[PDB]
């Protein structure tokens, strides 16, 4: 989950 969002960065 964290990674899925973190792609923005
Ligand atoms: C939430 O974005 C997210 C994405 C991907 C994963 C995840 C966990 C584990 C692996 C893996 O290769 O484990 C090997 C033991 C890959 N991707 N978790 C949470
Ligand atoms: N928000 N994330 C990025 O801007 C980003 C993170 C990681 C990477 C990237 C690209 C290529 C490799 C590799 N060849 O191992 C690893 N990580 N790009 C962009």
Task: Provide an overview of this structure.
The PDB classes it as de novo protein. The entry lists the keywords synthetic construct, DE novo protein. It forms a monomeric assembly. UIC-1 bound to benzene. The protein is UIC-1. The organism is synthetic construct. This protein has 9 residues and is mostly helical. It is built from one helix and no strands. The chain has one helix at residues 2-6. The protein is elongated. Bound molecules: ethyl 5'-formyl[2,2'-bipyridine]-5-carboxylate and 5'-(hydrazinecarbonyl)[2,2'-bipyridine]-5-carboxamide.
Structural topology:
Elements: H1 2-6
The chain binds ethyl 5'-formyl[2,2'-bipyridine]-5-carboxylate and 5'-(hydrazinecarbonyl)[2,2'-bipyridine]-5-carboxamide (I77).
User: How large is the count of helical segments?
Assistant: 1
Question: What is the radius of gyration computed over CA atoms, rounded to a whole number of angstroms?
Answer: 5 Å
Oligomer: monomer
Q: How many β strands by DSSP?
A: 0
- Ligands, ions, cofactors: ethyl 5'-formyl[2,2'-bipyridine]-5-carboxylate, 5'-(hydrazinecarbonyl)[2,2'-bipyridine]-5-carboxamide
Q: How would you characterize the largest beta sheet?
A: none
Q: Could you spell the SSE succession in H and E letters?
A: H
PDB class: de novo protein
Keywords: synthetic construct, DE novo protein
Assembly: monomeric
Entry title: UIC-1 bound to benzene
